[PDB]
């Protein structure tokens, strides 16, 4: 939080992926860590971009305290960020919402149950209902 | 949504307990027609055609051959108001301990009384069980009950009135002496074998206007037995207390480990929970829980739930233990305990070293009275004498007693269902009491 001094290293350029990769070295003297939103904010103006155009992960704090090493990415456009950044990091900051597809267990059971019927099942449902009405 | 209650059933031999129970289960969606028709065929080959309804609960070979309910048996049926399961009591002085095990895990009670000429007089006699079974119900914690006058066709005249009014008058005089208010108790005339006045109103007996009850909570007035089962009050379930479920049975189920089964007297049992059985001292984890072939997440108090243990064995586990959460205060072995007991007539005198088969909850064991502390008044715990020399019938007393065999017990203040007990000696109920203090091991 004090004297963050975000220094970037190993900067590279990828017109292939429309992104620039760099191992971001951040020092946090007398402070524990720097929050992910913190480095992303000042990552915008050093690369002359916006907040919602950068991506950083890692940040394993060096033993003893006062240093942290992480790897960061910057994307040129919002649409480029959507089409390249993975969904887990998208929902992470503010970029999208993770919809709960129930869980793996019920989906597998539903798939097997749907596999046990040959067709839509509307005729099967009405046939079993008529036969088992009594 | 529908609540859940638990009933037990009681009565004299050949009063029509299992016939009334089984046929009531059949009417309320228990079993389909081909199952009971099979039972009619097999019992006709045996020779006991009348017992086809009794066979539904009496499943054992020795029970069906003899035509005798030896051990208790469970069976469910959904009434109009809520869920309920029955305890089929033996109704014998031979198997009186099995009745005490069944009635101890029951909230309400269905006192079946014979109406036929001669059988009622034999039932309510010195040797009969109608006096005993009603007394044993109030002893173990069955506060509310229902009386059912059975065999109206057999009695003379069948479905008359007088005979019914004579039985209700005779029971009302005795049942007041036990503790039950006969105003609050419902008296229903029925026929178990015929299937009369149980589900629907009877055509054979229009004279019967209708039973009625006068409680503090709410009044009820029904025509049939089924409506009287709906009018039973929801009991007070102590969910907040530490678990104190004395086990009922321990099965080794196919493809799902060891499965301990028992009613949650107190607390909430659930899957993935370590438990400790009290006398044997065996710690183990439960795999899963069930109640009448249906799985459960939360086993609430007063339920026929059944956990399943794991990482151990069926012999380490046993009928009688208390799965007090190995995390919460578990049930410990009792070396000696302060358990007052009042007596209900011991032909012999009660002094010391006398080990009757203390049947606290579901467990029966001989207990020797180390000594007698104080002769106490019949009520309010009033101290009358210091250090008595002997005790007689019709007298209360605090007594410290050492079990002859490892037993688990607990105080009445902590656990009301656990604290109840009776005493038996010379094939008769000599005393009845409650435990206030207990020394752990």
């Amino acid at each position: 939080s004090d004297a963050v001094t975000i220094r970037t290293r190993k900067v590279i350029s990828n017109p292939l992926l429309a992104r620039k990769q760099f191992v971001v070295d951040v020092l946090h003297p007398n402070r524990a860590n720097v929050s992910k939103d913190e480095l992303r904010e000042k990552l915008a103006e050093v690369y002359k971009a916006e907040k919602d155009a950068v991506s950083v992960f890692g940040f394993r704090t060096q033993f003893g305290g006062g240093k942290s090493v992480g790897f960061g990415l910057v994307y040129n456009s919002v649409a480029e960020a959507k089409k390249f950044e993975p969904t887990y990091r998208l929902v992470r900051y503010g970029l999208a919402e993770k919809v709960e597809k129930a869980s793996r267990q019920q989906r597998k059971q539903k798939k097997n149950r749907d596999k046990k019927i040959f067709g839509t099942g509307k005729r099967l449902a009405k046939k079993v209902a008529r036969r088992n009405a009594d | 949504e529908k609540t859940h209650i638990n009933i037990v059933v009681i009565g004299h031999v050949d009063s029509g307990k299992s016939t009334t129970t089984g046929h009531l289960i059949y009417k309320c969606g228990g079993i389909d027609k081909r199952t009971i028709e099979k039972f009619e065929k097999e019992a006709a080959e045996m020779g006991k055609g009348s017992f086809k309804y009794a066979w539904v609960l009496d499943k054992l070979k020795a029970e069906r051959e003899r035509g005798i309910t030896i051990d208790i048996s469970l069976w469910k049926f959904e009434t109009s108001k809520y869920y309920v399961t029955i305890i089929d009591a033996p109704g014998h002085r031979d198997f009186i301990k099995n009745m005490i095990t069944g009635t101890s895990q029951a909230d309400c009670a269905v006192l079946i009384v014979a109406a036929g000429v001669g059988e009622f007089e034999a039932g309510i006699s010195k040797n009969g069980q109608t006096r005993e079974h009603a007394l044993l119900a109030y002893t173990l914690g069955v506060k509310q009950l229902i009386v059912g006058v059975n065999k109206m066709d057999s009695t003379e005249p069948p479905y008359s009135q007088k005979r019914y009014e004579e039985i209700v008058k005779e029971v009302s005089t005795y049942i007041k002496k036990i503790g039950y208010n006969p105003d609050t108790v419902a008296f229903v005339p029925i026929s178990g074998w015929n299937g009369d006045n149980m589900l629907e109103p009877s055509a054979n007996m229009p004279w019967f206007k209708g039973w009625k009850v006068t409680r503090k909570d709410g009044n009820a007035s029904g025509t049939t037995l089924l409506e009287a089962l709906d009018c039973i009050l929801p009991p007070t379930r102590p969910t907040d207390k530490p678990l104190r479920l004395p086990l009922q049975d321990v099965y080794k189920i196919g493809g799902i480990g060891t499965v301990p089964v028992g009613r949650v007297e107190t607390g909430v049992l659930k899957p993935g929970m370590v438990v400790t059985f009290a006398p044997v001292n065996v710690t183990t984890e439960v795999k899963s829980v069930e109640m009448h072939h249906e799985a459960l997440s939360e086993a609430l108090p007063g339920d026929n739930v059944g956990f399943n243990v794991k990482n151990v064995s069926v012999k380490d586990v046993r009928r009688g233990n208390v799965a007090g959460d190995s995390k919460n205060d578990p049930p410990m072995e009792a070396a000696g305990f302060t358990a007052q007991v009042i007596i209900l007539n011991h032909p012999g005198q009660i002094s010391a070293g006398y080990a009757p088969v203390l049947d606290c909850h579901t467990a029966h064991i001989a207990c020797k009275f180390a000594e007698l502390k104080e002769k106490i008044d019949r009520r309010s715990g009033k101290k009358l004498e210091d250090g008595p020399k002997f005790l007689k019938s019709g007298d209360a007393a605090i007594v410290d007693m050492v079990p002859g065999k490892p037993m688990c017990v607990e105080s009445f203040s902590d656990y009301p269902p656990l604290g109840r007990f009776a005493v038996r000696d010379m094939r008769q109920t000599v005393a009845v009491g409650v435990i206030k203090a207990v020394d752990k091991k």
Binding site: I12, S13, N14, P15, L16, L17, Q21, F84, P86 | -
Partner: protein, 258 residues
Amino acid sequence: ARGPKKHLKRLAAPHHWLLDKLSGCYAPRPSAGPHKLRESLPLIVFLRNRLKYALNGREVKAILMQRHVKVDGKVRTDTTYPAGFMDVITLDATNENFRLVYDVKGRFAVHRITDEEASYKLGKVKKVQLGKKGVPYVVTHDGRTIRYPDPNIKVNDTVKIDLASGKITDFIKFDAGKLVYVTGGRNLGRIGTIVHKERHDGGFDLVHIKDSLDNTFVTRLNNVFVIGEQGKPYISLPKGKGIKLSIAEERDRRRAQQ
């Protein structure tokens, strides 16, 4: 076992891929293609661990699906395409053309070539036969089939494939005084000149290739690749040019660089 195998555990993969042994238990098995699986390089490992352009497996898939790389003129879309020796990957973006040439140490390299050099690819022919309808053809090391070749072209020579048109434009005969490139074996990646050879008409022809520093070594004829005459390489040689310095000379080179 009851058919082919489509898997590669991350312990039987070729060691020149420079793959680790902790990131997963499997390896990117190359699909069937021009080169063998043990003598080529999948596009996934080349872009993820060599160029470091892509981090994860899906990033390589996204780059490949976006029609960016061009291997031997063809764009290609398979993540496990077996790109081996004499394979040129052209990237329209970043303005770099990459050529797969072995290094002195025994792995692949990231040698950068000009756009003119990427227009032609050298190829060592393996078989010359008279095919159906009487048409002659040659079989290069990459498996390319070129019809109606030069009659002077025989077995164990090298041709200059035009790549863009797929036509032979120049052929280099195999004789003494020819700069070659060893492909495969414990002596792979060495560049030297041929002095003589013992024919040994029982298989496994041997050729005595001599380095520019008077170092001589023996390599089977199946592992050689003529890349030009003496002193003039038809291809831009990688850095070092296969000097093959010893462990002592390498250590002094490091101490003279730090």
